[PDB]
């Protein structure tokens with residue numbers, strides 16, 4: 001059950017990656033907000049499902065894969081079998097979601113979180129239903145090679161507040177950033 005959510009951290013120039021790593025220096029409190037938002041379920045016997053494309057999965061340090069206490073599904077048309085550590089591999093968002101109903105998965109999933117990359121995010125962002133986008137706006141330009149698609153405002157509404165989401169500008173290592181929530185339903 002649950003809902004369909006996208007989570008992303010983006011630079012002013014809409015960059016989410018550079019050469020297998022983040023465009024910016026490590027931001028520990030941002031990391032920690034991603035972990036908590038994706039892991040938290042207040043339901044007993046369920047876990048959240050984290051969906052990620054091949055490049056996002058490999059951008060995570062092996063020391064952090066799989067993502068503990070979450071079901072990890074890799075989305076890829078080119079891998080031949082689930083990468084070591086991953087639970088499932090699916091060829092598309094559709095089948096991933098579909099997957100979410102057979103034997104293990106409809107009785108075990110709470111929320112669904114899409115953690116990257118651009119093509120997964122485009123796929124989803126343009127998928128029927130009630131989707132939420134949790135966006136961290138890093139207020140600085142960073143040289144990037146991977147990007148999040150423009151958010152078609154007035155299609156997507158910004159929510160003034162949402163539980164567990166800080167409303168204030170944050171700062172780390174002198175980079176300012178803020179958390180934003182957007183939603184849609186079609």
Ligand SMILES: COc1cc(CN(C)c2cnc3nc(N)nc(N)c3c2)cc(OC)c1OC
Nearest residue numbers: 007008009031034056059060061064115116136
């Ligand atoms: C989970 O651990 C790590 C994950 C990454 C890179 N990824 C995939 C990442 C980081 N931040 C994010 N923040 C928000 N808001 N949304 C995301 N979708 C997101 C995804 C890099 C690391 O170190 C280089 C890690 O080590 C802790």
